[PDB]
Structure 1
Amino acid sequence: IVNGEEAVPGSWPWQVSLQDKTGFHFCGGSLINENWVVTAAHCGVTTSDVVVAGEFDQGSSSEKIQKLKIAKVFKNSKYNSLTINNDITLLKLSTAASFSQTVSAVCLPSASDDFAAGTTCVTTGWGLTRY
């Protein structure tokens, strides 16, 4: 996020980090329940990648994070890689996340839900702070 601010730790409990086997953070995700994560199709997640729940400071070894294995990757069949449209993948976890004060689910909207232009929303992540 460019020009964002540090969040209060544990305050966005559905936010997960998608890391590869080398431990490199490559994409974020959101817990929708204990066994499922939603992320972007273009992240190219494989079952060799890990979902890290409960983390605030990735430079810290004393946080009680949950490193969860991915059982199955469900790329939306409508995803179009040429236009990046319908950019959603669901990850089914092999081990359920354990909900706590720092690990919990975000709600999903109704198909019929209305979110108006002008509404102030929030976005979170560990992406670049500068380009």
Structure 2
Amino acid sequence: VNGEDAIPGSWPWQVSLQDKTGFHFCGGSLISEDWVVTAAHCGVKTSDVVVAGEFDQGSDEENIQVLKIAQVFKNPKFNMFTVRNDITLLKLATPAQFSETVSAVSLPNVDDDFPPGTVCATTGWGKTKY
């Protein structure tokens, strides 16, 4: 068993990054209502949108909010050669309305650490760039 379907709304901070076509191409997390975190190798543009509160990209016309991006902050220490500091902060033009299926995730401290062996979760639609 590699993984299973998630209960809708079980991971509120989890967004889907898409382009003008409406096609998902990367994941991201809501760390605030106007700030979204993601990866640099994802190459996000102000031309891309942030879909929140979604679960099934199939149909299920669940109430999803298509947020707009205003700024993109790609860590400066990141290359396509050494792929380090793979982090990117997105600033939304329109903010997100927190709710039952949309909230933000807590960030840790520069001195916080998750020891080897502790179990953590990861979520997504399985779409990687590299």
Q: What's the CA shift for 1:81?
A: 2.3
Residue number in structure 2 paired with 1:124: 123
Residue 18 of structure 2: aligned partner: 19
TM-score by length of 2: 0.94
What's the CA shift string for 1:12-62, capped at 9, x where partnerless?
Answer: 000000011111110000000000000000100001111000000011251
Percent of pairs with identical residues: 77
Name the structure 1 match of 2:42. Answer: 43
1:98 equivalenced with 2:97 (yes/no): yes
Match of 1:113 in 2: 112
In structure 2, runs of 5+ residues without a counterpart are: none
**Structure 1: tracts of 5 or more residues without a match:** none
What is the RMSD computed on CA atoms of the aligned residues?
Answer: 1.2
Q: Distance in 2 between matches of 1:106 and 1:90?
A: 14
Question: Are 2:88 and 1:89 equivalent residues in the alignment?
Answer: yes
Q: How many residues align?
A: 127
2:99 partner letter: S
After superposing the two structures, state which structure 1 stretch, 16-25 or 53-62, moved more. 53-62
Q: Which SS does the other structure have where 1:33 is aligned?
A: coil
Displacement of 1:80 after TM fit? 2.5
Deviating 4+ runs (over 6 angstroms)? none
- Look up the match of 1:9: 8
